[PDB]
Every structure is written in C-alpha cells, then in structure tokens.
Amino acid sequence: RILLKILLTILIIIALFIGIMYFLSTRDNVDELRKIENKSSFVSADNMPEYVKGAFISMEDERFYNHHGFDLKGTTRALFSTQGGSTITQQVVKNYFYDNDRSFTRKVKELFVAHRVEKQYNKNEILSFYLNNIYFGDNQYTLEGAANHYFGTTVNKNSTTMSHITVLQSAILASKVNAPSVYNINNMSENFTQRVSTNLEKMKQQNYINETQYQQAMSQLNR
C-alpha cells in the first residue's frame, strides 16, 4: 500500500493548492466590472452593428456564446499545439484585474474569476466589458474612442451624428487587440494588413459579412 499513500499525498497537495488558488481569486470582485459602463465613451454591444461584434468574435472567440468561460477546443490548440488561447471572458478578467502580471498562479485564479463573471453576467454584458476595456493603441481603451480617434466613425448603430464604422475598420480594430504592439493602425505594415485579411476571411467564413462586403473591405485594404 505504498503507491496509494504517495498518489494520495500528491493528489491532495494539488487539491490543496487548487483550493488556495480559489481563495486568492476571491476576490478579485467581479461586481467591479460594472465600473466599465461609467466610461465617457461606453457603448454596449447590443448597440453595435453585428459585423462589428463579429469582427471580434471570429478573430478572438468564435464560439463565444457557446462556452461558460473556458473553451476546451480553443485551449487545446492553444496548448503549444503548432488565435488563442484565451476566451473573451478570460481577456476581460485579465484586462480589468491582472493589468500587470502573467504568472502560472495568476492563470489559475483567472480561471476561477472567469467562471464567476459568466455566472454573474450575461454574454452581451461580457462582450460589452471586452469591447470597452481593451487597448487599441494611441491611448484608446474603448472601441468607440478607438473608432472615433483613428477613423472618425462610430460603432453605435443608432447614431445619426457620426459616420458609421465600416467592415474594414471593424476588422482593423479587432485585429489590433492582440496584434504585436508594433502593429500601427496609423501606418499599417504588410504583416498588419495580412493579419486583418485573415480577420476578414473569418468574418466571411462565419457569415458576419457576405461576399460583397468582404471584397469591398479587401479592396479598401489595398490602396
């Protein structure tokens, strides 16, 4: 009975470690996320055109609405298995709280917190937290701030005061979020335009846009 007393002491130390991690993640109070809706330029996802929401979903988390914070498939491909690996929920937790570090223990507590926001918030609210708290360069942390700043367009579908964000622009912004900081929307390199091209194929292949919109976007991309 030697191999069971060691398999046990190990199985418990991990469960003990995992238990502590929970308490560390607690909290980390997800109620805090509502503070994002106070931003001067906050626009909720439900008030954005569908291709805009889809520029981000197809690029970052194509099964966004299906999961409960953790995407197994996307996280296996992501496990250094030759567009991952964090779900939009995980990125929301990372951006709001762990604005600083990226350690293994932070990655485990990040999982606990993510589960908690999925529990507390609906998918639309979570998508709104995401789009309103990511870095798009030039000190822009909101999609609308970004859209205004780079293009002078808006992402509020209801808006009538400002021109509407194009398919290309939605794809530039979505591509920028996890692009290397070197990618500069003010002066796009070939690697950047290649990246958005991919974002566009995905939008088309997932039917957030049709062939026509896509071709028009690609065309605009190449001037």
Ligand SMILES: [Mg+2]
């Ligand atoms: Mg994941």
